[PDB]
Each structure stands twice: as C-alpha cells, then as structure tokens.
Amino acid sequence: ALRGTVTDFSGFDGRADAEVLRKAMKGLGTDEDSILNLLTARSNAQRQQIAEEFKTLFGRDLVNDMKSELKGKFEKLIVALMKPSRLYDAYELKHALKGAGTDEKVLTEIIASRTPEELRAIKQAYEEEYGSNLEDDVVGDTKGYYQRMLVVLLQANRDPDTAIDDAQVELDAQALFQAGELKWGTDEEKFITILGTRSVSHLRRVFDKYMTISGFQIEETIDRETKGNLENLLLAVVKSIRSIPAYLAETLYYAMKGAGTDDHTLIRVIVSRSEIDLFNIRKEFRKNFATSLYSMIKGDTSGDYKKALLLLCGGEDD
C-alpha cells in the first residue's frame, strides 16, 4: 500500500541524459527547464548513474556544475534531489545538529517518523560519511528527557509485532494513566519506555484502551502533561505510530499553511519520501485538510522551484 510518486525511468540511457544536462548548462545562461524536467523524471538511483556518466564524459562534477548554474530554492531542491537516498536523512540530521543551535524540529521529525530498519541504516551512513557517531552528536546537542527519548528511539530496538496480549494492553494503558493524569507531576520515564519500546501494533491498541479508561486520547494527555521539545517529540511518536504518512502529511500542511513557506521542510519531506510513501502522504493530506497537496504547493511556491515541486508531487486531486 506504500507508494512513492517517483520511479525508475523505463528507457533510461544514463549517457544520453548526461549530454542533455551538459547542453543545458554549457555556454551563457541556463536551460533550467530541461534540467528540471529531466531530473524529476528519474529515480534517485538513476540520478546517481547520470552523475557518473557526466563525469566520465566531461570530467566535470554534475552537482558542482548545477550549484554554479542554479540559484536559490530551486538549486536547494535539485541539490537535495541529487543526494543519494541512503545518505539524505543522515545529511539533514547532520545539518540540524550543526551550527551553535540545533534544529530540534528536524531531529524530532526524522527520528520519530523513521522505522528501526531506517534508523539502523541512517546511523551507519552518518558515521561512515561524517566520521561521528549519530547518538554521540545528538546527546551532545540535546538535554533532559527530550534527549533520552531520542536516544531510546535511536537504539532502533522497538519490540517486534507479534500477537497482541490483551492483559498487556490493559496493563500499559493503566500504567500511562497512573503515570500522568493520576499523578502529581509526570513520570516521563514511564512514557518514554512504553512509547519508545513497545511494538507499533501493541501501542495502537493501547492508545484505544487508554481512551476508554481515561476519556482522553493519548495526545490530549501529552498536551496536558508535557511541554516543550518533549511534548513535540511525544506527539510525533504517537502520530507516527498511528500513521507515518498522516504524520508527514500534517508536517507538510503546517510548513505551507501560515504565511510564507518553510521551504526546508517542504523540500525535505517531498524529496526524502518521493520514492517511499509520498503517494500515501498525498491521500492522507486531502482527507484531513480538504485540499490537494498539489494545489497547496501550487499556491505557496513559484518559479522553476514550484514546477519541479509539482512534478515530483503530482496528482492534482490526489
């Protein structure tokens, strides 16, 4: 059921494509249109081969060439599109941790919505690319229970999905009830362990049972019990447990919504998910926000940036 919007090009000719790209940048000016139309029509793996051919044919670096030709957000998008899939998330994480400050929004968004299998891969790529340990970096840049919850998640050791044990579902729902609503203060340690290590199928049942017992959806309790980064993280985990696509569709909505656009987030979610579940994200989006992702992007963005974006997204109605 998980569908992306970008797939492998049928009659792919890495060499032919490279020539088209050279021609589009050679001499005075840039044919941004041909670049944009070609790249959003190739899978990430094909973009990498195109980059290889371009280098053996011209002895020039494609990405470095595009960076000198392209400008602004269009450049940022195309550059993101050229990053190998297995390196992109690591790349975004590294840059969220970089600088004096730390972009918790990015850490929270990626660590909460990625599966353990994905976190495992992201950690390997991170280390072999930046020569640093992802966990060490996160710990060094975060504090309190927010940091603890991230580290628990980074262990990529969530319980596997097996037959649901009802007594166990009851036990956990009551535990969460006593750890929050019935407690003076909050036992965050309890929330972290349960929310961070139980299997996804188990927690979905726990969320429902928790509603029955308390009359509150777990999200309401989280909002009532916590605040700050921890709150954001816990809501992200809960939301992702329920549906990653729905969670990401929501992240997108709020990136555009307001005034102006959180282009970094808009670019990050579309590119990182283009070959995973961007189609599903499209569906959850229309259902929940009554708008088509396409129409939303088409109204908040402009220029080639907007054209490339819509081509990667697609489906005006879906």
Interface contacts to Ca ion, rule CB under 5 A? 183, 223, 227, 300
Shortest separation between residue 148's beta carbon and Ca ion, angstroms: 18
102 or 261, CB closer to Ca ion? 261
Query: Cα separations (Å) of 131 from 102, 127, 153, 243?
Result: 19, 5, 21, 33
Give the other-Cβ count within 10 Å of 183's Cβ. Answer: 12
The residue count for the chain: 318
- Amino acid making up residue 297: I
Q: How many CA atoms lie within 13 A of 309 on its CB side?
A: 28
Residue 157 beta carbon to Ca ion: minimum distance, rounded to whole angstroms: 28
State the Cα–Cα distance between residues 252 and 246, nearest whole angstrom.
10
Q: Could you tell me how many helices (H) and strands (E) the chain has, helices first?
A: 20, 0
With respect to Ca ion, which residue has the nearer C-beta, 227 or 287?
Answer: 227
Torsion angle (degrees, nearest 10) of CA 44, 46, 51, 55 = 160
Using left for φ > 0, alpha for ψ between -120 and 50, and beta otherwise, residue 126 falls in alpha
> Minimal distance in Å, beta carbon 224 to Ca ion?
7
Least CB distance from residue 182 to Ca ion, whole Å?
Answer: 7
Question: Which among 141, 139, 128, 143 is positioned nearest to 91, based on CA atoms?
Answer: 128
Task: Considering the complex, state which of residue 144 and residue 160 has its C-beta at the smaller distance from Ca ion.
Answer: 144
Residue facing Ca ion at closest CB distance: 227
Smallest distance, Ca ion to C-beta of residue 61, A: 14
Q: Cβ of residue 154: shortest distance to Ca ion, in angstroms?
A: 24
Smallest CA-to-CA distance from 266 within 242, 283, 280, 249 is with 249
Rounded to 10 degrees, the C-alpha dihedral 9/76/255/307 comes to: -50
Q: At its nearest, how many Å lie between Ca ion and the CB of residue 289?
A: 13
- The residues, any chain, with a CB within 8 Å of residue 159's CB and separated by 6 or more, are 197, 198, 199, 202
CB of 257 to Ca ion, least distance (A): 6
Q: Between 155 and 217, whose beta carbon lies closer to Ca ion?
A: 217
Report residue 163: phi and psi, to 5°.
-60, 135
In this complex, which beta carbon is closest to Ca ion, that of residue 76 or of residue 242? Answer: 76
CB 96 within 8 A of CB 106: yes
> Whose Cβ is closer to Ca ion: residue 127's or residue 223's?
223
Of 90 and 235, which has the nearer Cβ to Ca ion? 235
CA distance 172 to 57: 61
Which residue, 201 or 261, is less far from Ca ion as judged by CB? 261
